[PDB]
Amino acid sequence: KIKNYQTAPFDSRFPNQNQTRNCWQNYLDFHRCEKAMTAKGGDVSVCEWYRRVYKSLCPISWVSTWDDRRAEGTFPGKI
Amino acid sequence: MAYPMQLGFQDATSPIMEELLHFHDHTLMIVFLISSLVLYIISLMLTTKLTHTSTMDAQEVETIWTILPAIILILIALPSLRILYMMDEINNPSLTVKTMGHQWYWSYEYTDYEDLSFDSYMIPTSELKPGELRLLEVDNRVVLPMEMTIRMLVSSEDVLHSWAVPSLGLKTDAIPGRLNQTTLMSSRPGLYYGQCSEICGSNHSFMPIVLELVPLKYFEKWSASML
Amino acid sequence: ITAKPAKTPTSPKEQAIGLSVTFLSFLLPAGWVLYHLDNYKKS
Amino acid sequence: FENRVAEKQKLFQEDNGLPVHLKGGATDNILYRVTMTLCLGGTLYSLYCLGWASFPHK
Amino acid sequence: HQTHAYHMVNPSPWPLTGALSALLMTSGLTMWFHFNSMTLLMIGLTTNMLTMYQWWRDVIRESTFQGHHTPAVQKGLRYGMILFIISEVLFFTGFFWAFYHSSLAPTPELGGCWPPTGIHPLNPLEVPLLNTSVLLASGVSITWAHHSLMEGDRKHMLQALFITITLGVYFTLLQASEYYEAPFTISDGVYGSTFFVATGFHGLHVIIGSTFLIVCFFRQLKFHFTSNHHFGFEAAAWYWHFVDVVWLFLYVSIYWWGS
Amino acid sequence: APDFHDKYGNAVLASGATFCVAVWVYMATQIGIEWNPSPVGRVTPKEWR
Amino acid sequence: ASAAKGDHGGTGARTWRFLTFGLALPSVALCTLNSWLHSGHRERPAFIPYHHLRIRTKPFSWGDGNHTFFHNPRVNPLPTGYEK
Amino acid sequence: HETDEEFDARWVTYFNKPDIDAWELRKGMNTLVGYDLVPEPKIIDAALRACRRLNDFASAVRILEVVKDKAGPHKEIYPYVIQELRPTLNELGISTPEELGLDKV
Amino acid sequence: STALAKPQMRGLLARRLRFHIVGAFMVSLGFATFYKFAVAEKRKKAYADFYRNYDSMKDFEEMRKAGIFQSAK
Amino acid sequence: SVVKSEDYALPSYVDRRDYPLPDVAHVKNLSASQKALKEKEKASWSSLSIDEKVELYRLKFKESFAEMNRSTNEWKTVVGAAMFFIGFTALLLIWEKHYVYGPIPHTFEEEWVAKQTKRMLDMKVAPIQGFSAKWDYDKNEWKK
Amino acid sequence: HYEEGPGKNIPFSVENKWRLLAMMTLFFGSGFAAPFFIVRHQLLKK
Amino acid sequence: ASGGGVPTDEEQATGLEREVMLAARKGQDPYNILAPKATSGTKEDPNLVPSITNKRIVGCICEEDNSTVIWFWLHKGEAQRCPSCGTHYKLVPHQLAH
Amino acid sequence: MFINRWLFSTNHKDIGTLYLLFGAWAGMVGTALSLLIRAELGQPGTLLGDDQIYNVVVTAHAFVMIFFMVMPIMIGGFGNWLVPLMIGAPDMAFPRMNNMSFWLLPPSFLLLLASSMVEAGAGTGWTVYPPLAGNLAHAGASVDLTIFSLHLAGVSSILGAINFITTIINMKPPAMSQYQTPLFVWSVMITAVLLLLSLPVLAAGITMLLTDRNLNTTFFDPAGGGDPILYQHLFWFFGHPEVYILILPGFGMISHIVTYYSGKKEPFGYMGMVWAMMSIGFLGFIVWAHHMFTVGMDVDTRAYFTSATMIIAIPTGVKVFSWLATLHGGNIKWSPAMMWALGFIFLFTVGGLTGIVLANSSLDIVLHDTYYVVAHFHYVLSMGAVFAIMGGFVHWFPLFSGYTLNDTWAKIHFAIMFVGVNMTFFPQHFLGLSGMPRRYSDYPDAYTMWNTISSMGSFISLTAVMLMVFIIWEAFASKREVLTVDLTTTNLEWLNGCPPPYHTFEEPTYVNLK
Ligand code: HEA
Ligand SMILES: CCCCC/C=C\C/C=C/C/C=C\C/C=C\CCCC(=O)O[C@H](COC(=O)CCCCCCCCCCCCCCCCC)COP(=O)(O)OCCN
Ligand SMILES: CCCCC/C=C/C/C=C/CCCCCCCC(=O)O[C@H](COC(=O)CCCCCCCCCCCCCCC)COP(=O)(O)OCC[N+](C)(C)C
Ligand SMILES: CCCCCC/C=C\CCCCCCCCCC(=O)O[C@H](COC(=O)CCCCCCCCCCCCCCC)COP(=O)(O)OC[C@@H](O)CO
Ligand SMILES: CCCCCCCCCCO[C@@H]1O[C@H](CO)[C@@H](O[C@H]2O[C@H](CO)[C@@H](O)[C@H](O)[C@H]2O)[C@H](O)[C@H]1O
Ligand code: CUA
Ligand SMILES: [Cu+2]
Ligand SMILES: [Mg+2]
Ligand code: NA
Ligand SMILES: [Zn+2]
């Protein structure tokens, strides 16, 4: 749709120095999308943008901790 | 980096650093002038045997000495805030790099495309190679493309640190649980140094930052070779 | 201000003694620690 | 109950040079000594505890 | 002989004993937290209690029994008490600031929502509303006590003050019971931290104000107060209104708005 | 009557100045302090790589 | 807002006693009924070992170090879940 | 408010008061030297004659010293004021500080 | 002999003050001029001159040949 | 004459050029001849001798204006003593260097500094004004 | 009452200048030496 | 609704508090709670300064609203003058049984 | 008699003298810590150990100079001695509670010296930020002892502040309005209102830190939904007002000392000086986040804190120009106290102006956490609060003691200290602009020259501090007793003689209304 992805674009929802919620919201959006896909039988490739953005923005250790907690059943955000 | 006997700021490597130097020059003249005026007026009040010790009326003179300072402050604040809103303006980065502070070293993550990350530690003084700078060099430099807008995102995995590079005008604190953003754009290739800038325990003096600014195609091949 | 002459004048020699003892009281204990630092550290 | 404030007024105003904290009589002296002995004793004890805690235990 | 109206106080050991009790309580909390021992702390709590008792005893001796509280002395003590309440209001403001900072911007660890994921707040219409009625009622009954005292009515002063103290105690027992029953604890992240530290300092101040009203109750039983001179009672009524207003802000902020 | 300053002022000024200059020059030049001045106009650059 | 109540023209103790028994204590009695009515145990929620809860960065200075000060076995799980 | 002439006239009248007392003489000179001026000859003349009515020769001399002092480094002011006072100095037999050696340090 | 002329006697401190505050202002202007010229303007011109024909690839090549970089030999 | 500590609440004498007429006379007790001179002062001052006028002045006042305003040599003592103690400080610093400081790092050895200087020039440290700007990359020497 | 006057409104004696010098030396001297001995203590420990 | 049992200050104030309440009832001010009103301050009509000893400090606010107060000891004897404005004060010593 | 007089005091002079002795002793501790700092930095490499021991020393230096030297001397020592005498009051309103403010300080100091003795000390900086100050990176008792030391010092000053406010409002002569009290009394009242409102906020923040370290709360721990940055706001909501608390009583002493040695009856523009101190006290509560310009706050918040911080230059400038207008036309007496006050006027102005530089957030990005901040605040603290303290101590020492200092020695002491503090701090501006960070035990080699000079400066100031102890000994050894003092009609604190009797104003002054 919009390949040649370089990095995450400016997002007017998160215009300030603190970008923590940008990473978090994209991580959520990705995982929500992926659940909505696969579930309804459709294709996870439509969630790809959120995946690229959270990968770009989020520290590896945050992603890794959140992934562990989703596996353990202790992820506190709603997916 | 700083050089011996240096008096002022490191030379500007970025346009926003250039702006800060001219705004510092403007502000320092003011500082110079007010301090000199005060020292001079002091010597003027103290160098005569003539006296006038009876009550003196204050209202006229207090207007001058409120209004002129107010005007001088507005003449500092106008360019100060222009620069503040400039750094904040939207600029479209081509790359995002994260750095995480640790006790006591920085790690870097370049994860726009591949999973590239590594640790960056001070070279111990007994291992410096001849010509290298004590407490400043690192084993793995933060290689970046010159002449491009880069988003740096800064955090910490333990205590506070702060990620600074004076010649680019940069200092962003590294706070665990928070992701702070800044932008970086070097006008020139080369090696640009900084040092951890928030007290963080036994080796705070010894976890420096070295950026290595090179043409895009060199940065890409270096990125690929670091996987 | 005006004041009376000293009730117990402190001559130049007595001032030399007070000054020296006062400087030694700061210099000697700190000097002893800093002289022995290498002993404390590479202990 | 009856109002015996006038009796306390005479007691506390008696011209015996006693400071107010001991003017009630010998029970004030006792409670004063008990308080000051626990404070000074506890303070020596807190110093002992600093000396103890100032060195590793290992 | 002085010919001003102010009180030159006799030399006193209680400032030194109270200062040493503070050293003993703090070095005691240190030994409790880090060296597994309650000894210093119990000695400091004891000396602190002995110090307050004798110091305020002596202020009663100086005033009711010796007559040193002229109007200029009382007016100082009014300022003193007002300023002390102001400093306690600022101390609570730092905890309210902590509460709003964390709840207005809940971080990802909490689930990015308030109350955090996994927290089940108390229902504010149950025991917390009951506690609100209890402290508001006790601000009505102390005001009755105050007017009976000014009107010279000993029996209704004592009756209204007893009611006011009984409501303070009821709030303190209802709170102790809600702490026991609460399914979250002080270790339940910033929700349990702000909840228990802010309501817990408030409960301590309810215990302090109730103690102070009990002191006034026994002085009243001993006839110390006149219908025009009773600053200890006014101070404890101002401190009691302070504790009720802090509760109202906690109820609205933490129990209600933060549920 | 001349006071302390009339009798000793000149000597105190002369000797304190001589002593101050002498001991600062010595401390600054004779005991191995590394002031780390600028290399500019002073150091000949040497091959490092 | 006057409230809906309504007086002055004299003053004092008698009015505040009227307010204490006519309005304030009735309100307490009412809230006390309301409360002691929604009282008695509610079903404890499934235990989930969420990492932002049951914090332990240093043992508590009492008990076994792992119980909160007014721990209620019925409704306060430990970091490893409700007690046996 | 007032002209220089009115300022001077009020001071002349202050010191010309026949039964001026010692306290008023000191109050007047110690207030006057607080101003940013050296007092005109006619003010000093009236203060010197007040000294005479109060039989105080020393304070006449001290008044002349304080005129010189209020001139600061304007060394032309004092010799001009003494020149203008000479008839009064001669009439009252007031010696100047210099004629008494009281200018010597 | 000749009389001495009457000198100014009044407002001497105020006059000295007026004269020197104006002096101090004039100096501040003449310093501001020199400071704009020796420091600020000089800096603007050093940066404008440096970048006018600056070739960043050529600067990079010199650094690279001097062996300074990790990423480029 | 003799000022006492227990006279603090009484008007007192002071020499200062801005309070020329102090609240009491310098000398209030008079000898037989000094009483006769105060009587003589009630008559024409032209009949007082110069010594009598100076004696009246010194009864009323302690020091003249020229005495009380005189300059002193105190500055020599202050500046000289301050330089002494500044000089003494350099003794402490010599002692510290000799007995407290060890060798500084090897990066300050002359050959290290030469090499580091070339490497700073090779990376064009501060090439606009501060450092490399002062090096002539064409003549390979420091700019004049 | 208490003593009043120069040298009497202080908790230390100034009756003898030398004994005063000793006490002042112990007093200021102990405050200045303490952080060196604490540093020595922190180095010795480990 | 009401009854008695609370002592009044008249019955129970004591010590200095009682002295002050009893003097105020007589219009008197032995403990200096009120500011004295100035006379015209001339030598015929000086401000009269009570004292229990032989001297008392006066502060003179020479004109209304001056922020500077002029302080001096006033001694028993002849009226003295404020050294800034000259208004006259005279000490009237004695007793504390005024 | 001794214990009744000196441990059980209810007397404002004696308790003032206790605070002066305690503050002088603290000052020798803070001076030793400052020389350990400058010995570590005085040549390249490591002298003492790594940054732990070094920042234990830096952290204790600041707490001792602020809480145990400057606040006790200015407010406990000069405030207790002078305020009651300057309003004709017989003592403070709460003379017994006043003695507890004093006695809580030796235990607060003991806790701070315990913190440095146990474990590895609290190497946190005087701001005590978490998580470095929390129970994982600073495990064990040191930081809790520092928290408790701050609680005791906080209670001592909060009760002090209640006492000064009450005394100043309630115990003036009935004719004196607050606009007839001297400027030093206004400066203590304002400073005490700042203490009353700011200390309880620090007490709340450091209590939160205590419970995060010992009760498993998570106010500042993101794992529980907390935020380290919240601690910074609570701390600096107190810490900005605190620097105005450290300077305001200095401004009040400077106004008295300048007026007195200019031979004037009053300071120029009295109601302007009052307005200026209340405006600075008020503005000092709405600017705290200028200590947090690199923490990642929003741009409009950084624009508001830049502007509100700058505005404080207006009322501050009124005071500097009014001190100049007070010298104007004076009969200048070049006493050693006057020299300290003239040094204050100029060197405070220098450090206020570098503060103005730093108020600019965009520039503060590069100056923050470098020695440029260290230079700013030591010009207003070592060459402002300290110069006002040494000016007031040599000025009023003959009132408190009844004995005179030798003025020649005091001028020599002023000259050595002036050279030593400028040699020490002036070069730190260069270190900061060129990028040397704060809280470092060692620096890259390029920073050597200015650190060496700064360390040589600190030793010259050590020689001045040693000579000061001798000068005080000399005055008590020679016993030259005061006879008369100039200008008592406008300096009421001298009018009861030197030293004043134990009870003064037993009969109050007479002041009529008219
Ligand atoms: C006495 C102590 C004191 C005082 C009075 C001040 C006064 C001020 N300070 Fe300072 N400051 C400190 C002690 C003090 N400071 C300390 C301890 C720190 C660091 C804390 C830490 O991190 O540990 C600090 C840190 C600090 C910072 C944070 C910098 C950083 O960490 O990056 C800033 C930022 O704005 C600041 C600004 C100011 C300003 C604008 C003033 C102003 O109030 C100064 C106003 C005065 C003047 C401007 C001079 C007089 C005026 C005139 C002659 C009129 C003409 C002037 C103009 C037109 C400008 N200071
Ligand atoms: C109506 C309640 C009144 C309180 C009664 C309880 C005892 C302590 C009293 C003090 C209360 C003040 C607040 C101190 C902080 C914590 C206590 C908060 C209130 C409370 O009691 O919280 C309890 C935890 O107590 C705990 O940790 C207890 C830890 C107890 C140790 C206290 C720690 C010391 C605090 C130091 C205070 C310093 C203040 C300085 C003053 C500032 C100077 C200007 C809650 O229990 P929980 O099991 O976690 O959850 C309930 C589960 N069913
Ligand atoms: C950002 C930087 C800003 C820097 C601003 C600096 C401001 C400089 C201002 C200059 C003010 C000029 C005033 C000159 C005063 C000096 C002494 C003097 O000259 O004394 C008198 C001035 O006093 C008067 O009243 C007139 C006024 C009242 C008394 C005099 C005091 C005013 C002096 C203020 C001095 C300030 C000095 C330092 C400031 C930095 C002169 O006497 P007059 O003829 O008026 O008598 C007439 C009598 N009447 C009143 C009854 C009519
Ligand atoms: C769990 C417990 C441990 C924690 C410690 C705290 C414990 C509880 C203490 C409760 C407080 C009791 C106060 C009793 C004071 C009695 C003395 C008194 O009330 O004294 C009155 C003066 O008021 C005065 O000093 C007013 C005195 C003001 C008292 C201040 C009270 C609040 C202090 C509380 C400390 C707060 C801790 C903050 C915690 C974060 C006496 O003057 P009158 O009443 O006019 O009488 C005179 C008439 O008789 C003449 O006709
Ligand atoms: C004037 C009167 C005031 C002065 C009072 C002086 C009192 C001195 C007695 C202190 O000794 C005791 O020692 C206990 C046992 O030796 C300690 O228990 C501690 O000792 C062990 C090590 O932690 C553990 O077994 C315990 O649980 C732990 O609490 C604890 O510190 C204290 O009770
Ligand atoms: Cu990492 Cu400082
Ligand atoms: Cu600030
Ligand atoms: Mg920082
Ligand atoms: Na070092
Ligand atoms: Zn007057």
Residue numbers in the entry:
A (entry chain H): 7 to 85
B (entry chain B): 1 to 227
C (entry chain M): 1 to 43
D (entry chain J): 1 to 58
E (entry chain C): 3 to 261
F (entry chain K): 6 to 54
G (entry chain G): 1 to 84
H (entry chain E): 5 to 109
Question: Which lines from the publication concern this structure?
Answer:
5 is the terminal oxidase of cellular respiration that reduces O2 to water, coupled with a proton-pumping process. The enzyme includes two redox-active metal sites as the low-potential sites (heme a (Fea) and CuA). These sites donate electrons to the O2 reduction site that comprises two high potential metal sites (heme a3 (Fea3) and CuB). The third proton-conducting pathway, the H-pathway, extends for proton pumping from the N-side surface to the P-side surface.
